């Protein structure tokens, strides 16, 4: 309860950790820890009745986040872990269910069959992109096929529980915390041309309420990099 890091403080009360490993450390690299280990809280999204989903590409969502966005634009490469806290607060009179996964290497498929999706339609820096529940038309400029029942990656959406995940069921549970280590082939990769994680939130059982309750439930995502280092002089 009320854990702090740097000059920030959030509070909790169950933690699911990665693929069984805690994130640890390894020219010679430099290891910054004093000014970056803090909880970057993204601005909250609203879960309405007919909502469909959200995704954030993870080492891109902190690209305009102040000092961490100055370590990225000064340094070519880098390897980080992550620690995500998702918590939505509804009353005892709301009902629904979320699925909070964290997909490594989530290559997405374009709407047009011949091209590839462009940069702005894949990754919104510190802003959520949204799934839909219809098909997206093909003769446009360039967009992502965001039908939610194929999860944007051509795979069945029920099978997404093989990735490290957590359910948020508003009847019993309230929050979900994940810890994700460094999952990559090369030991240090470029952070401007590679989004090595993707946090998805998919509401399976949609929201419902009676007339009079608040017609929206907000969702707060809080990311905090742990065990980060760069290669530079």
């Amino acid at each position, epitope marked *: 309860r009320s854990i702090t890091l740097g000059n920030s403080t959030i509070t909790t009360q169950n933690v699911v950790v990665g693929y069984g490993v805690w994130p640890e450390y390894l020219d010679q690299p430099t290891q910054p820890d004093v000014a970056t280990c803090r909880f970057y809280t993204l601005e909250s999204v609203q879960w309405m009745k007919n909502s469909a989903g959200w995704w954030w590409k993870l080492p891109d969502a902190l690209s305009q986040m102040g000092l961490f966005g100055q370590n990225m634009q000064y340094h070519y490469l880098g390897r980080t872990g992550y620690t995500i806290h998702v918590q939505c607060n509804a009353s005892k009179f709301h009902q629904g269910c979320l699925l909070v996964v964290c997909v490594p290497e989530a290559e997405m498929g374009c709407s047009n069959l011949n091209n590839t999706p462009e940069f702005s339609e894949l990754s919104g820096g510190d802003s959520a992109r949204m799934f839909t529940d219809t098909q997206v*038309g093909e003769s*446009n*400029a360039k967009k992502v096929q965001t039908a939610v029942w194929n999860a944007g990656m051509g795979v069945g959406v029920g099978n997404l529980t093989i990735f490290p995940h957590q359910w948020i069921n508003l009847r019993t549970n309230n929050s979900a915390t994940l810890v994700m280590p460094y999952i990559n082939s090369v030991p240090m990769d470029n952070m401007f041309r590679h989004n090595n994680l993707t946090l998805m939130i998919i509401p399976f059982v949609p929201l419902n309420y009676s007339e009079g309750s608040s017609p929206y439930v907000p969702i707060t995502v809080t990311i905090a990099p742990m065990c980060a280092e760069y290669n530079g002089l």
Partner: antibody
Amino acid sequence: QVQLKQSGPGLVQPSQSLSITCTVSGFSLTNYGVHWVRQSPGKGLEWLGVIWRGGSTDYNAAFMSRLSITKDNSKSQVFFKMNSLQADDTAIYYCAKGDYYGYDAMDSWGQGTSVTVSR
Amino acid sequence: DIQMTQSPASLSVSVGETVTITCRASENVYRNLAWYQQKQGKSPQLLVYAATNLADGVPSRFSGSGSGTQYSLKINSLQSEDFGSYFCQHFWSPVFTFGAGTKLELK
């Protein structure tokens, strides 16, 4: 929250060019695309063109050589140009943002600038 | 391209009935349809997007349904502000085409 608005000429001579500029507030141009819809009481609503959030644009087929839409991300402005302006363009002109929860529908519309092309 | 045929051209109903407006497409659009309501002398307001979902400030009187090439919009109980112009418009592929339009007199 305050939203987009536009400002144009109002009247133009035939076989000239047309220039309206739509300026937004409350959101950025790197997350939503802006459309152009022409309300004419003789032909109903018609869709002219759009510039997506990536920067690449897409126009109607019947107005390909006449339209040129552009935007600039820093100044929060768009610029669209129409030329050769025949007498069937006596209508009112709207700019409206798209991508209402990622669904490519017009969220909120401008106040509109009515144009008339006669002398 | 794809043409939208909206019917009827106008209506004359009173306050407190049900009303159904349908518009048919040329081919399949996969539920990518938006409905707008316009009053006199103003910009249109979005009513229903993607053929089922209601908008933000729109009350639950309106209801849209359909799949494939036939869609429909239903208002269960009229009020004293639901008269004006109504359009249906698809966003499947450019060129996006609007409907013909309909009117409510509220005699």
